[PDB]
Design an enzyme around this catalytic site. Structure first.
Site, short mmCIF file in Angstrom:
data_model
loop_
_atom_site.label_atom_id
_atom_site.label_comp_id
_atom_site.label_asym_id
_atom_site.label_seq_id
_atom_site.Cartn_x
_atom_site.Cartn_y
_atom_site.Cartn_z
N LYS A 165 0.84 -1.19 0.00
CA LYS A 165 0.00 0.00 0.00
C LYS A 165 0.88 1.25 0.00
O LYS A 165 1.89 1.30 0.72
CB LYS A 165 -0.92 0.00 1.22
CG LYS A 165 -1.85 -1.19 1.29
CD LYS A 165 -2.71 -1.14 2.54
CE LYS A 165 -3.55 0.13 2.58
NZ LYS A 165 -4.44 0.24 1.39
N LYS A 190 4.65 -2.80 -11.51
CA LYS A 190 3.96 -2.51 -12.76
C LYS A 190 2.70 -1.71 -12.46
O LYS A 190 2.12 -1.80 -11.38
CB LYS A 190 3.61 -3.79 -13.53
CG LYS A 190 3.22 -3.52 -14.98
CD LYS A 190 3.02 -4.79 -15.78
CE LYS A 190 2.65 -4.45 -17.21
NZ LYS A 190 3.74 -3.70 -17.90
N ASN A 191 2.30 -0.93 -13.45
CA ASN A 191 1.10 -0.11 -13.40
C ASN A 191 -0.05 -0.81 -14.12
O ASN A 191 0.12 -1.86 -14.74
CB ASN A 191 1.37 1.28 -14.00
CG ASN A 191 1.73 1.22 -15.48
OD1 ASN A 191 1.67 0.18 -16.12
ND2 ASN A 191 2.11 2.37 -16.03
N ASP A 192 -1.23 -0.21 -14.01
CA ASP A 192 -2.40 -0.73 -14.70
C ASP A 192 -2.15 -0.77 -16.21
O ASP A 192 -1.61 0.18 -16.78
CB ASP A 192 -3.62 0.14 -14.39
CG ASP A 192 -4.93 -0.61 -14.54
OD1 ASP A 192 -4.89 -1.84 -14.79
OD2 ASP A 192 -6.00 0.02 -14.41
N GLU A 193 -2.55 -1.87 -16.84
CA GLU A 193 -2.21 -2.12 -18.23
C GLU A 193 -2.94 -1.26 -19.27
O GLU A 193 -2.33 -0.89 -20.27
CB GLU A 193 -2.41 -3.61 -18.56
CG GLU A 193 -3.86 -4.08 -18.66
CD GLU A 193 -4.45 -4.46 -17.31
OE1 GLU A 193 -3.88 -4.08 -16.27
OE2 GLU A 193 -5.49 -5.15 -17.30
N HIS A 286 -0.34 -6.55 -16.71
CA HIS A 286 -0.59 -6.30 -15.30
C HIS A 286 -1.68 -7.23 -14.80
O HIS A 286 -2.63 -7.55 -15.53
CB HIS A 286 -0.99 -4.84 -15.08
CG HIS A 286 -1.00 -4.42 -13.65
ND1 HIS A 286 0.12 -3.94 -13.00
CD2 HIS A 286 -2.00 -4.40 -12.73
CE1 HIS A 286 -0.19 -3.65 -11.75
NE2 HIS A 286 -1.47 -3.92 -11.56
N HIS A 320 -6.66 -14.86 -20.08
CA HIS A 320 -8.07 -14.67 -19.72
C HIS A 320 -8.86 -15.94 -20.05
O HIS A 320 -9.63 -16.01 -21.01
CB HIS A 320 -8.63 -13.45 -20.44
CG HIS A 320 -8.22 -12.14 -19.84
ND1 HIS A 320 -8.54 -10.93 -20.40
CD2 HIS A 320 -7.50 -11.86 -18.73
CE1 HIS A 320 -8.04 -9.95 -19.66
NE2 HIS A 320 -7.40 -10.49 -18.64
N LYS A 328 -25.06 -19.68 -9.49
CA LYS A 328 -26.30 -19.86 -10.26
C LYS A 328 -27.04 -21.05 -9.67
O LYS A 328 -27.17 -21.14 -8.44
CB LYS A 328 -25.96 -19.95 -11.74
CG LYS A 328 -25.14 -18.78 -12.27
CD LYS A 328 -25.85 -17.45 -12.06
CE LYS A 328 -24.98 -16.29 -12.51
NZ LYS A 328 -23.71 -16.21 -11.73
#
Lengths: 459, 524, 524, 524
Positions: A165, A190-193, A286, A320, A328
């Protein structure tokens, strides 16, 4: 004409292993109960493959396998094993390469639209060890690039980092450098992609590449640049002149210096110049998942895990795939069979094992919750992929503490050279059960971690 | 698509205009005086053709209701192709007529379901009436005539088809091959011919093309995968005693086996036939058994208990003659009892009823014929591939129509039987006024295919339909001559099955679609 | 994906305008007055060219119907290129005539089916007519004439082709690779020629300028690794008894074995050289079989009944003369008897055409060039890529035209055969009035190419056409010189094959396209 | 998107049209004068159906508030799917009644607490009166009557279902099957049927096709699998002397086991058959324990102190006859003592009384039916898939009606008994004026379904209402005959408890909708 009567494979995967030169590329023809027969083949390859002005042929000519030459074996559950053949295509004297339109017509199966995505978990069918004959063959990741500095192949180290943090923003180097100045787990940030010089980008598009001019603190400062400073330019025609021969001081560490891998505009285009020298531009994505298409509210994406079988060159730290499919309505042979496949007591098999003539790192991602206290859980098959155990930071609110555990790109070294069963994946720590206080969206119905949030006065 | 509610005539007239466009897009393609229709596909080559099923598959409209009605009527065309494949335009026009007139009646507000029940009764009565009116088609010259009708007055194709059918017999298979030149060619392969070749060119015999011709050989059966195993030599020992030419049915022949065989042949020691496997496990399961039966031999396996080491030269069966070339090998015939052949037919009868149906029963029939009858291959003479598309479409249509007509017989073309039976079936009545009106509207609308045929000729449909009703029996109208005459004796004969299937499918879909009262549509 | 219907005139005019644009681009490419067009290049500079098929390949219009009609005529253009290769101007103008007569038929309410059948009958009669008018070409002078005609009145190309014809035979030819010199050159080589170079430092042999040449060394390839045949003492002693230089081409030899061979050369006892195996195992072994047959020896195989390490001077093939350079290996004179040559030719006979055609033809022709044909390569000096593109296109077209003339023959150039066959078939009659009218319309339209030819020279179209029609035989008008006289004495000759193929494919596509009545359209 | 707030009537107003739209979709559909609505799917074909719940499942409009009202009202349809499956139209008309009564109540302003008290009191009183009016149903003709009325007076299929019900008994459970022919067919399967066929073609017993039919078979329980030890001979050979059939139960069969089975089948040792593993652990344990107990077999498990070598000759199971085909193995009946069979059925009923009460209990009902009843199959003679769907909806509605009547029995359908009990419940009183008003409002709310029934055929509302309310007993109205008469003669007998459940869901949803105070939604 017609399509079939060319391959009558009537044996199981064992025959598909003995051949050695069998490469599978096709879509599963499992017609969904509810979708009837005609649509299964109507949208299979009739309108989503090539477009096919009339028809095309290769220079070798007389190719019999334009359609799906389906040798699919169907005796128990319609276990689909279909290949678009590539080895039977044009074989040349020196390169063995086909023409421009050969692969363009048949090999890119496109599931662009058909409903075959409600739940379809595809576990293991992989190109065997007999792959180096007339193919290049990728088996290297960042755990094998800087391997001489302390990373072996399978779960043996990495360069992908955990962040203390604050999560992201107010870049560490000026003031928050103490977060990165802790070699104990802050080692590669690393930063947001979803950023870069994209057409749909905010005012920060100038800032990203500007991160190049501030590389002045890697030589005289005493620290080596290990941030993903998003400076990977879009237009390549500038490096051409000088850097070719000697001035390659930037290094092969495409996952130490930044690399933009968003999944739409970059891919693995680097194949051209670096067929053999540098086939390893790390899959620099990321760690974002379970928020794009997996959610039934927001389904934006598609399924291509079968076709990704050639992509091992990147050194994936993220793909992904989807989700386990829990929630469900259950019953009717409830979807909890994930546990019932191995955890059942009264099962038995004496003879064979998981040996497909070329095993490699293969373990599904820990989704929801899987702690070392549930040792009878997920450690059966292999237990580790090309990733390192890193989850939400619920119990991770301390500076050093168990210094060993936080070593994201260093404790994997010990935890795989310790050589103590499949527990190595979770050998690090087990207090991760508290991490559910931070991230709710993984355990929602079955695990009792959400019971405190809502649901009337009970615990 | 999005969900939006619309009611009554708002969809109804759309349905009307919907079918109205589709049908007159298609109906204009009938007749030599009529032209073809151009199907737009930039990703492909836009196709100018008469292929009804191709047009139906190509159907998609901008209007929402028109598009859903179009995909509705595409289903019946697809089912007809699954059933017959030709006369599809007739099914579409009759379906359009019946649905439009039923909707016209419902516009007066009668009960749609009772109308449907009356129409269904009329349909069943028409089915049994077709049974009554069916004329068997047996003589091969009439078969050629009806195939030519399906070929639309292509005499050479018709006679060639008749030749092929006569040569293959009742259950002999007929296959179509892509023509290359301008000359029609019919070829008949007798026995079993597969695409397998010997890799060593040292096996080439004196004649060109590498053809080895060998009669009275030795049938060999191998169930285990044997490639170059040195344990075969005991079998060779029997051959060593035989000193006779023979054919080997094995998976493949690798280095040592090919080496010893080649040196034996070139040095003149022993000549042997051994080729790579034509099919894999599933096909060899059939091939070993059927070759043993056709050759009167006993199956030889390496699994279970029986193996290669124990064998007899007489355990190897015999053939009539075999011919080998670069990649193709044929076996003309063998001496096997008919009793075993029909035993295999009986056991494969249970295989005929299968969960796959298409794509595999065809292979079963091909196997049965190649064991028993002969295989027909046609290359139709034609110039360019786009027109060979229509050529082969006509060929397959004629073939399948003959398949229907040979057993189920034929009736006069043009739908004249429908009008004649409508005249026959005037007195049939329903429960109430609704069913009677449904019967009346069905019988009124069922004349439409013939009137559309007349319109395609550019003539008065009412007059022709008003005169033909005056006529009876074999009298009808010829479009090629555009005049009356003997409808049947001229030779426009079509299988009754196509008519039955068309009317049944059209009635089934029409009854359910005419009763709609509310409908859903996508967002604008 | 939603589509809509359009009726008749709209897309009729659409494809009309498309063909109009095509003809506008083509007319500038007519005859000796034919000019070039700029074809856009995305990355590099656009190409100035006359090639009609390439222009079709580059077609890009905004209108969907114009583009699809352009693809339709591109289809026939590409088939003509595959069959004829040129006459693209003729193809475009005949297509314009076809669409004009189709419009006239639409205006006539004419029967398209009868139209196409009558056109087919007239085309068959015209095939007979062109077979009648064709004259065999034998003299090299006429071959040079036709080469010059095809090469756009360039005598250098015609004479070069005639020279190649005279010396290296009919079939033996190779493609063109040209230089930057600004001059012309032809290289012709006979015997065995294939790209292989030498690698080791010693391989610069005794001949100066780094050349290698040997008299009667024996090469033989074992079809496998050559590791312990480093020993090869029987080979060494056999060649030493023969007193010949050491040269064997092998499948693969260890680098250290190559090094000790170089040591053998330096010591001078045996001067041994080798190069890499020819090519892919199958085609390499086929061509090595050819080499062995020409050398009269038997190839060594890893799986043959004779030892890799064992060889004899008699086991070796025999040859006279070999020349090896840094790039290419050549065998000048080999020891082979003609019966083996004709046996190899006999086994070629089936593989000549087959079905695969081009893929196995190329090497086969190369093989033929090695056996009976010849190696012929044209090296024209040209530095500018722009000129070399057009030069290559023209020379390829001239080559193909010369081959077509050789195989089928030529008729008179300038398209006069069109009016001659029209006059000879002016009174052709069909089955009915429809066939007669269709034939008459086809005849009237088929002179439109010639009217286009004459008008594009800026001269009296009707006058010239009628005057040439009034005369007969060799009476005809030269557009290049623009004067009447004996057309053959003017050397105005065009191959019959290209005209026949173009006419036949034109008939096919016209009969297919005249069925245009209803069209499908997509969203913008 | 963003939140939108609506207060009181603002929401109430919206709610109106929502169910109104739903009413427009649904109410008109019931009855022979009722029609069907089209619900299309983008990928598939449109489905035209009369089932109200089928309409409800996919109901969605553009408006947020109408959509949310629709999703409340869809809950009763979903619960009907779960429990009843029919009367969905009744649930919808109940929803219309309650929304009308709710708007009227808001107009007058009664306390929703007292309103729901009156509603539930009236519902319970209706339940009591219906239970009082219950009539037993046992004879088969009433079963046919209820099946027909459920299939909308389908005498043919209704009688077919009644006959099937009679022949398989109450315990017989029926399945859904694909349609191939044009006519329905009925099949009865007895004993344990499972997907187990012979692996090797040599397993053919006397009835050809690999079928093994054995009367009074002797069944071995070979727990798990046996390959390496391979010697079941202590019992195998003993029964071989006994000259009796053999049955093996093992999870896996290897090459050795197949080899020895082939030895037994071919050499003639003794007739032996084997069966593979069933499947999952639970299912296999259940269906082996039950078979062993029913057949008197011995619980054999290497999990327990036992071996194939350590076995007893009494371990054999016994059945009546077993029939094994290519894919399916069937046990027609087992040999067991009555007391043991009834005790095992009692313990499986103890399993029936399960807290799961779910699909596990349905797979248990499979076993229970095989204990007592059998598998019933109605293979429909549907021609098209959509008509198949409608047929199967009809037959499943009939099945639901029959099964409900099995436990409850039937009472007069069509709402005549419902209006009768409402008229009785017209004397109900509440605590305060709010409760009395709520009760009488519920009285009109229950009057609503019958008057909408009247208006569906467009009949005299007041006349029917008066003549029925004044009347009593079996005097009622029939829509099929559209006239008054005896209820028994009309024969619309319905298991009321489905209507009971529907009306109590309606009471609950009315109680929740009378809480209409304010609403917050998202922006479109």
């Amino acid at each position: 004409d017609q399509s079939s009567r060319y391959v009558n494979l009537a044996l199981k995967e064992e025959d598909l292993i003995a051949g050695g030169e069998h490469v599978l590329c096709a879509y599963i023809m499992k017609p969904k109960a509810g979708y009837g027969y005609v649509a299964t083949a109507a949208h299979f390859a009739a309108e989503s493959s090539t477009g096919t002005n009339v028809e095309v042929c290769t220079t070798d000519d007389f190719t019999r396998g334009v359609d799906a030459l389906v040798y699919e074996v169907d005796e128990a559950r319609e276990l689909t094993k279909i290949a678009y053949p590539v080895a039977l295509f044009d074989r040349n004297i020196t390169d063995g390469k086909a023409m421009i339109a050969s692969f363009l017509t048949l090999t890119m199966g496109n599931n662009q639209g058909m409903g075959d995505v409600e739940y379809a978990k595809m576990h293991d069918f992989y190109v065997p060890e007999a792959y180096r004959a007339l193919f290049d063959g990728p088996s290297v990741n960042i755990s094998a690039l800087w391997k001489v500095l302390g990373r072996p192949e399978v779960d043996g180290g990495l360069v992908v980092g955990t962040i203390i943090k604050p999560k992201l923003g107010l870049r560490p180097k000026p003031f928050a450098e103490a977060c990165h100045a802790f070699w104990l787990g802050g080692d590669f940030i690393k930063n947001d992609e979803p950023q870069g010089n994209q057409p749909f980008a905010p005012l920060r598009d100038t800032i990203a590449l500007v991160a190049d001019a501030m590389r002045r603190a890697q030589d005289e400062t005493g620290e080596a640049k290990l941030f993903s400073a998003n400076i990977t330019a879009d237009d390549p025609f500038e490096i051409i002149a000088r850097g070719e021969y000697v001035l390659e001081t930037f290094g092969e560490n495409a996952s130490h210096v930044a690399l933009l891998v968003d999944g739409y505009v970059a891919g693995a285009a680097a194949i051209t110049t670096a067929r053999r020298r540098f086939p390893d531009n790390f899959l620099h994505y990321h760690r974002a998942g379970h928020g794009a298409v997996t959610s039934p509210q927001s389904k934006r994406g598609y399924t291509a895990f079968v076709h990704c079988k050639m992509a091992r060159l990147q050194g994936a730290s993220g793909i992904h795939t989807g989700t386990m499919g829990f929630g469900k309505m259950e019953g009717e042979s409830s979807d909890r069979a994930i546990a019932y496949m191995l955890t059942q007591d009264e099962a038995q098999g004496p003879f064979y094992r998981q040996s497909w003539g070329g095993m490699k790192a293969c373990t599904p991602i820990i989704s929801g919750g899987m702690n070392a206290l549930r040792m009878p859980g997920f450690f059966e098959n292999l237990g580790n992929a090309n990733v390192i155990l890193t989850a939400g930071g619920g119990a991770f609110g301390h500076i050093d503490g168990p210094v060993a555990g936080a070593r994201s790109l260093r404790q994997a070294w010990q935890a795989w050279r310790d050589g103590v069963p499949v527990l190595d994946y979770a050998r690090e720590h087990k207090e991760l059960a508290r991490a559910f206080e931070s991230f709710p969206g993984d355990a929602d119905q079955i695990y009792p971690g959400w019971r405190k949030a809502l649901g009337v006065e009970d615990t | 698509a999005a969900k939006d509610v619309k009611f009554g005539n708002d969809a109804r007239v759309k349905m009307l205009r919907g079918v109205n466009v589709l049908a007159d897009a298609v109906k204009v393609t009938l007749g030599p005086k009529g032209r073809n229709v151009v199907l737009d596909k930039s990703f492909g080559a836009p196709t100018i053709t008469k292929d009804g099923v191709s047009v139906a598959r190509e159907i998609e409209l901008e209007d929402k209701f028109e598009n859903m009605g179009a995909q509705m009527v595409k289903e019946v065309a697809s089912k007809a192709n699954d059933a017959a494949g030709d006369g599809t335009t007739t099914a579409t026009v009759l379906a359009q007529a019946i649905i439009t007139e039923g909707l016209k009646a419902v516009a007066a507000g009668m009960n749609p379901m009772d109308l449907k029940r009356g129409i269904d009764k009329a349909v069943t009565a028409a089915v049994e009436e077709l049974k009554a009116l069916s004329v068997p088609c047996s003589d091969s010259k009439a078969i050629a005539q009806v195939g030519t009708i399906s070929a639309n007055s292509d005499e050479t194709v018709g006679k060639l088809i008749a030749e092929a059918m006569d040569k293959v017999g009742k259950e002999g298979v007929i296959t179509v091959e892509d023509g290359t030149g301008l000359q029609d060619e019919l070829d008949v392969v007798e026995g079993m011919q597969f695409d397998r070749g010997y890799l060593s060119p040292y096996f080439i015999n004196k004649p060109e093309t590498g053809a080895v011709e060998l009669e009275s050989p030795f049938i060999l059966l191998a169930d285990k995968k044997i490639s170059n195993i040195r344990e075969m030599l005991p079998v060779l020992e029997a051959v060593a005693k035989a000193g006779k030419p023979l054919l080997i049915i094995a998976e493949d022949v690798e280095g040592e086996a090919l080496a010893t065989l080649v040196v034996n042949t070139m040095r003149g020691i022993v000549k042997v036939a051994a080729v790579k496997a034509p099919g894999f496990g599933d096909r060899r399961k059939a091939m070993l058994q059927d070759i043993a039966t056709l050759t009167g031999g006993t199956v030889i396996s390496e699994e279970i208990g029986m193996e290669l080491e124990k064998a007899t030269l007489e355990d190897l069966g015999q053939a009539k003659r075999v011919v080998i070339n670069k990649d193709t090998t044929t076996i003309i015939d063998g001496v096997g009892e008919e009793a075993a052949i029909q035993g295999r037919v009986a056991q494969i009868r249970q295989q005929i009823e299968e969960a796959t149906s298409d794509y595999d029963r065809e292979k079963l029939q091909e196997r049965v014929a190649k064991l028993a009858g002969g295989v027909a291959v046609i290359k139709v003479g034609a110039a360019t591939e786009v027109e060979m598309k229509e050529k082969k479409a006509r060929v397959e249509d004629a073939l399948h129509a003959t398949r229907a007509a040979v057993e189920e017989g034929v009736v006069a073309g043009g739908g004249v039987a429908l009008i004649r039976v409508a005249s026959k079936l005037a007195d049939l009545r329903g429960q109430n006024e609704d069913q009677n009106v449904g019967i009346k509207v069905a019988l009124r609308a069922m004349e439409a295919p013939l009137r559309q045929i007349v319109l395609n000729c550019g003539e008065e449909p009412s007059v022709v339909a008003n005169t033909v009703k005056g006529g009876d029996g074999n009298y009808g109208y010829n479009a090629a001559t555009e005049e009356y005459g003997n409808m049947i004796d001229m030779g426009i004969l079509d299988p009754t099955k196509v008519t039955r299937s068309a009317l049944q499918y059209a009635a089934s879909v029409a009854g359910l679609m005419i009763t709609t009262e509310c409908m859903v549509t996508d967002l604008p």
